[PDB]
Amino acid sequence: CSIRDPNSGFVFNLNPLNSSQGYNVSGIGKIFMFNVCGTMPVCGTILGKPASGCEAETQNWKPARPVGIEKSLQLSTEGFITLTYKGPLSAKGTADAFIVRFVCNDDVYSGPLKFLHQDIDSGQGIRNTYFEFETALACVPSPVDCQVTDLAGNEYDLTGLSTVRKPWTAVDTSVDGRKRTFYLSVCNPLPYIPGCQGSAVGSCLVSEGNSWNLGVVQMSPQASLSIMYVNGDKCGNQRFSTRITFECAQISGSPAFQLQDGCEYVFIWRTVEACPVVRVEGDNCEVKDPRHGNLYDLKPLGLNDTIVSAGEYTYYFRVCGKLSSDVCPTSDKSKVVSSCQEKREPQGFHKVAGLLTQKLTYENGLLKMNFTGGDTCHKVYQRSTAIFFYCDRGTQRPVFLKETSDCSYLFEWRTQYACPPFDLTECSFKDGAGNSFDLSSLSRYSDNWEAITGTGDPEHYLINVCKSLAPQAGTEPCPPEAAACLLGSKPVNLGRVRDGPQWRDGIIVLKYVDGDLCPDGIRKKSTTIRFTCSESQVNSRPMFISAVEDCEYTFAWPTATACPMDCQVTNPSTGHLFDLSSLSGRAGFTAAYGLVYMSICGENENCPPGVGACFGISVGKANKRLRYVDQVLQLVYKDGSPCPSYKSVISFVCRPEAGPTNRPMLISLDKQTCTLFFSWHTPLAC
Ligand SMILES: *[C@@H]1O[C@H](CO)[C@@H](O[C@@H]2O[C@H](CO)[C@@H](O[C@@H]3O[C@H](CO)[C@@H](O)[C@H](O[C@H]4O[C@H](CO)[C@@H](O)[C@H](O)[C@@H]4O[C@H]4O[C@H](CO)[C@@H](O)[C@H](O)[C@@H]4O[C@H]4O[C@H](CO)[C@@H](O)[C@H](O)[C@@H]4O)[C@@H]3O)[C@H](O)[C@H]2NC(C)=O)[C@H](O)[C@H]1NC(C)=O
Ligand SMILES: *[C@@H]1O[C@H](CO)[C@@H](O)[C@H](O)[C@H]1NC(C)=O
């Protein structure tokens, strides 16, 4: 059922509206039903044909005025889209008609079908009936409002995704061969891409110098969140479509190509923009958290003037208070200075950077302060000072970020004062052998770990290491005491922090306890994290393993962190262990000069005992601290004879074949530091 707008040049398709339940509405004491670009087998059979529309009176097996033998679709005088189902020639040479108009609504897809009126010419036996059908398919390809509300009343905004300077893209290749780059836009047309322009192209595939428009910017986002772009260029008998499913997540994600269902390309987009927008203003330097319920109080940060240095300038500000420092002098009028830029001489001056304010704003889990009303910059702008507060264990000094185009001076401050109540545990332990383990690097204060489960899993798992969870984005927050959490019906506490990690039956176990009540109503849920040493897993995530009787939850985590902290050293990136013990020995070797005697990993029989190298005079004591640096193995022999302290740096370099003269060579003598630099090309370094 497809037509062209002469004003627009767009190809409209109502194809997607073929449905099976069809569409059914009341009026004039009877119910009118039909389907679109499809049949309505209920009340069918005009001749032997299945009928597109019907009529009946009810509340009914019996149909009436079956219609759909002559189907017609066209633009009227307005340039508005009309579909006519004419039925059979009853009498007097005229057929019963259904006339249905398609009216643009960006916000809905198969939007309310309302009966309008019917014209009754009894004289000519034509009972002609008139309908309106709201759809986004009627809308000409144009940019869309990118703000959404769900039925629960949570507001979102995906404008973040559309405002980017770069075009979002998902690359995807097959087992061998196929290589393609998906361009996605949100609510706005794609940026200029060679081969993809059309009218309002939302998703585009480029492969082998062929571009495909896989959906036009048509319908607004729907509520988790979804967008569909439809009416892309021909795919056999159909036209291409793209579905993007948004999911609320800690990261600023990219859209990831998931699968292809006929002519529809489906993507999953895990991003922070998809998270319910909730924002709150406070005064008296305090603000209440809408999710947890706790009160942030930043008054403690204002008990002294805060000084931050930048390049040549130096910034003074007092949190929620008047500056005490003898700079930017201004008491005149009703202006209380809270922020000052001082450019130190030369060509230095003092500029007021912000006035007193005790307003603390909370915007989607960030705390902000803006000191306004400063000295004029760029004729029209008043200098302002913004501080962004993030949760952290200790309240460290703020750091200068940048000056905006409107002379807003931006500061980040990670401080515990921005952190809800939170439990903490010692995260280093030792095994039976005395090897050191420290998982403290996996403790996250601003975010949490998202567990890896199955790809369709309706539930997500949040975990932190050796502490209770950081605050989470959304309006369904976990109980504050939880260190692990389940996110179905309600947020489920899976366990609180009690003890640190322990070597239990030859594996690293972290146990959280006293979560929500188990279904039997006598026990409380507990979580076990089983850590397994894996050098390659450097950014790894915990994999959810099992949930026994909705009571015992178990995760596994292969990670490089869980690994223990003899002339051998490990490549920190690959894990290949280089052993230089096979070269050691009191016997040792000589390097060209006069000569130089030296032994590695051990002492030499020509020098004083305990000295690694000498000539004749000690040039360094033997030692065992081997470093891997820049694909080279390195020893430093220090504390030698007096420098007219002599020292020897020995560097081992990869050589796939053992050369005809495979002995170390003195490559430098630094006279300013009395340092002897040796290089040795040996197959042992590969
Ligand atoms: C801490 O608090 C202070 C106080 O709240 C905040 O500082 C303020 O920042 C405001 C920006 O939101 C700024 O308002 C601006 O007033 C200027 C005066 O010239 C006005 O030009 C700005 O107007 C822009 O937008 C309006 C409405 O759309 C337009 O009518 C106007 O022509 C300007 O349009 C352009 O810039 C917009 C963004 O600024 C663009 O969206 C828009 O596309 C358009 O771009 C064109 O012109 C731009 C140059 O102006 C150019 O970059 C672009 O290429 C195009 O050529 C706006 O009303 C306040 O002036 C400022 N406070 C003071 C004292 O001046 C500060 O943000 C706070 N810090 C934090 C953390 O928020
Ligand atoms: C309409 O959809 C029905 C059922 O959903 C399917 O059997 C049929 O092939 C579709 N027909 C057209 C005209 O697209």
mmCIF file of C-alpha atoms and ligand atoms in Angstrom, residues 15 17-21 35-39 237-238, ligand 2:
data_model
loop_
_atom_site.group_PDB
_atom_site.id
_atom_site.type_symbol
_atom_site.label_atom_id
_atom_site.label_comp_id
_atom_site.label_asym_id
_atom_site.label_seq_id
_atom_site.Cartn_x
_atom_site.Cartn_y
_atom_site.Cartn_z
ATOM 1 C CA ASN A 15 3.138 -2.280 4.991
ATOM 2 C CA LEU A 17 0.412 -2.304 9.779
ATOM 3 C CA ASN A 18 -0.563 -5.741 8.322
ATOM 4 C CA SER A 19 -1.671 -7.276 11.681
ATOM 5 C CA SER A 20 -3.756 -10.398 12.547
ATOM 6 C CA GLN A 21 -6.006 -9.041 15.317
ATOM 7 C CA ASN A 35 -6.863 -4.675 8.658
ATOM 8 C CA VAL A 36 -4.438 -2.523 6.552
ATOM 9 C CA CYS A 37 -2.258 -3.783 3.593
ATOM 10 C CA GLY A 38 -3.569 -7.224 4.647
ATOM 11 C CA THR A 39 -6.826 -9.217 4.938
ATOM 12 C CA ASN A 237 9.251 -7.392 -1.360
ATOM 13 C CA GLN A 238 9.752 -5.362 1.914
HETATM 14 C C1 LIG B 2 -0.027 -10.220 6.345
HETATM 15 O O1 LIG B 2 0.287 -10.856 7.521
HETATM 16 C C2 LIG B 2 -0.193 -12.145 7.590
HETATM 17 C C3 LIG B 2 -0.223 -12.578 9.048
HETATM 18 O O2 LIG B 2 0.406 -11.712 9.995
HETATM 19 C C4 LIG B 2 0.689 -12.948 6.658
HETATM 20 O O3 LIG B 2 0.240 -14.308 6.508
HETATM 21 C C5 LIG B 2 0.679 -12.291 5.293
HETATM 22 O O4 LIG B 2 1.670 -12.886 4.467
HETATM 23 C C6 LIG B 2 0.845 -10.790 5.285
HETATM 24 N N1 LIG B 2 0.339 -10.328 4.027
HETATM 25 C C7 LIG B 2 0.740 -9.283 3.331
HETATM 26 C C8 LIG B 2 -0.193 -8.806 2.292
HETATM 27 O O5 LIG B 2 1.753 -8.706 3.579
#
